[PDB]
Each structure stands twice: as C-alpha cells, then as structure tokens.
Amino acid sequence: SGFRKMAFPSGKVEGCMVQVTCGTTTLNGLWLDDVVYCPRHVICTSEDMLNPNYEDLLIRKSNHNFLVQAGNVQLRVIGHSMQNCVLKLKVDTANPKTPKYKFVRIQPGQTFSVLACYNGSPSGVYQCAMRPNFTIKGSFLNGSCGSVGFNIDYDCVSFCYMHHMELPTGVHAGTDLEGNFYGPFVDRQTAQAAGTDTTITVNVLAWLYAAVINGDRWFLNRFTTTLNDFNLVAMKYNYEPLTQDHVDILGPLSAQTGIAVLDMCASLKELLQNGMNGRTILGSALLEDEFTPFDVVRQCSGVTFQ
C-alpha cells in the first residue's frame, strides 16, 4: 500500500542530455539520433532577451559557434536550423543511447516527469502536470532551460515538454519538442499574462479513488448526485467541469472500488462545501489534482516499463 508522487524512471532520458553553449549562454540540449534540440534563446545575450530578433541572431551564427558537449566529449555541429522556438543542431555523431522516442503535444490536465538538468547533467526528477492555463509548477533555476518533460509507455519515451521561461508568479512555461509553446506565451522577456488556474476535477476524483484503495475512506458519504448538480457546485470553487468523458476515464477506478463516479462526486461536493475539519487524505490537508486516473491505476497496479 501507500501512495506517493511518483515520476517515471529517467534512465532513458539521462542518456540524451547534453550541454549547449553559444557565447555566454549555456543550457541543456536533447540529443536524439544526430540532432540536438535546445531552446532557441541560447543564441541570445542578456540584452537581446528583451526583444530578440532570433532569425537575425541565428544568421550571424555558424556551426562552430555552438559548443555541444556530451559529458566530457565535444560533439561537432555540422548544421543548424530553427523550428519555431527550438534550435535543431545536426551533429556528426548519432547518440548511441538514443531510445525509442516520440514527440507528443499533451493536453491540459495531463501529467509528465521532468528531468531537471544543468550544464547537461541531471539534477533531479519530479512529476508535473500541465495546468489548465498551460503552465507548470516546476523547479527551475538559471541554466535549466532545455530540461524536458516526458512520459514512458512500455519502452517508448514520449517527449512532451521543453523548459523555456519562468513567470514572476512562480510558474513555468515551455514548448513541445516541435518548438510550439504551450499557451499564449512567447520566448521574450516582456510582460505576459497567464490565465487564472483551475483545479483539475477528474484528477481530484482519481486521487480520492487512490485514497479508498489505500484505506482512507472517512470522506465517503451516503449520498449520490447528478453530473449537472455536481458541476454547479464545483464551478463555485474554481473546479473544471466534469465531462462524461472524464466519467468514462474513471471507470477502471470505479469498478475496482465499487464506488460509482457520481457517488464519489457527492463525497467531493461535501468536501468542497464543508472542508476537511483538520483531517487529512493520504497525508494531505488539501485536495491533490496532479494525479491522472492513469497515474493512479499505474501506481496501484504496479505497471512497469522497459
């Protein structure tokens, strides 16, 4: 038993991290086959980031201006191209540690593991969720750009996020591996408003199901509710509306616990309107919304990866 914030094993991603240096700016790159992917603002100076002209800055750069180091061995760049907000540096050596990989663009509410790196070396791994406002609540310092978010399915690593910037709110914004930002953000040091965040309701319900599987059942009440009446209450507390698709995704958890989804919604409705009265659920005094139903079933059934 037990339930913990669990991240994917990072071994397959660790073998792909390199250091990319262009002048003074050094950050991390993703070495897949004979291509190194990294944020394009590596070609920027501190004065350029206020309003950078990336194409103009890149034209003044040639292949030798990019210092790519994998561990202690330097990789030679033999070509560079810019795809949206990421640079693609073709190197003369293909990464022998390249795993089976995929480039995916995740949806809001989905989770992924972040491998925080500095100077091409991993610092730690943690689990994140794509917030409804297309930000993430990560842990990034100077030089962390190029760190990637990923999921592992069987033996295939699904790269879905690359870190680019931090907003003064404390949250972080980035792109997919094709260079397209998540949300209305741009890679420039200027005022950008992030929309108000919302609680991921289907993830809270999945977390409550995990609590039942682990023996934390005090919050279960004797009532049921309709999907419409639940969403009217959840909307009041800044919860996303629960769709029938979300009810279907919670199917596996509902059958394992014998608790209908609308019955669990009735318990969540009482938790929102009355609070916890100083009690905890799975060791938390707040409702957790960064566990997908797939995360819950994977941890509660022991799904492994190759």
Ligand X SMILES: *C(=O)[C@H](C[C@@H]1CCCNC1=O)NC(=O)[C@H](CC(C)C)NC(=O)[C@@H](NC(=O)C1CCCCC1)C(C)C
Contact residues toward ligand X (CB under 6 A) are: 1, 27, 41, 49, 140-145, 163-168, 172, 187-189, 191-192
Q: Is residue 185 within the footprint of a second copy (CB under 8 A)?
A: no
- Following DSSP, what letter does each residue of 215-255 receive, concatenated? T--TT--S----HHHHHHHHHHTTBPPPPHHHHHHTHHHHH
Q: Environment class of residue 92 by beta-carbon count within 10 Å: exposed (0-12), middle (13-18) or buried (19+)?
A: exposed
Q: Is residue 6 within the footprint of a second copy (CB under 8 A)?
A: yes
Looking at beta carbons only, is 141 or 286 nearer to ligand X?
141
In the complex, least distance from residue 23 CB atom to a second copy, rounded to whole angstroms: 20
DSSP 157: E
Non-local (6+) Cβ contacts of 273 within 8 A are: 233
Partner that binds at residue 123, options ligand X, a second copy, none, CB closer than 5 to 8 Å by kind: a second copy
In the complex, least distance from residue 49 CB atom to ligand X, rounded to whole angstroms: 4
Partner that binds at residue 191, options a second copy, ligand X, none, CB closer than 5 to 8 Å by kind: ligand X
Q: Is residue 283 within the footprint of a second copy (CB under 8 A)?
A: yes
Q: 198 with 290: CB under 8 angstroms?
A: no
Catalytic residues: 41, 145
CA distance 78 to 101: 23
Q: Is residue 139 within the footprint of a second copy (CB under 8 A)?
A: yes
Partner that binds at residue 189, options a second copy, ligand X, none, CB closer than 5 to 8 Å by kind: ligand X
In the complex, least distance from residue 100 CB atom to ligand X, rounded to whole angstroms: 28
Tell me the Ramachandran region of residue 279: left when phi exceeds 0, alpha when psi lies from -120 to 50, beta otherwise: beta
CA distance 21 to 61: 12
**Among residues 160, 156, 183, which one has the least CA distance to residue 172?**
183
3-state SS class at 55: helix
| Subset of 113-132 contacting a second copy (CB under 8 A) | 115-119, 121-126, 128
In the complex, least distance from residue 243 CB atom to a second copy, rounded to whole angstroms: 26
The site for a second copy (CB under 8 A) is made up of 1-12, 14-15, 71, 115-119, 121-126, 128, 137-144, 166, 170-172, 214-215, 280, 283-286, 298-306
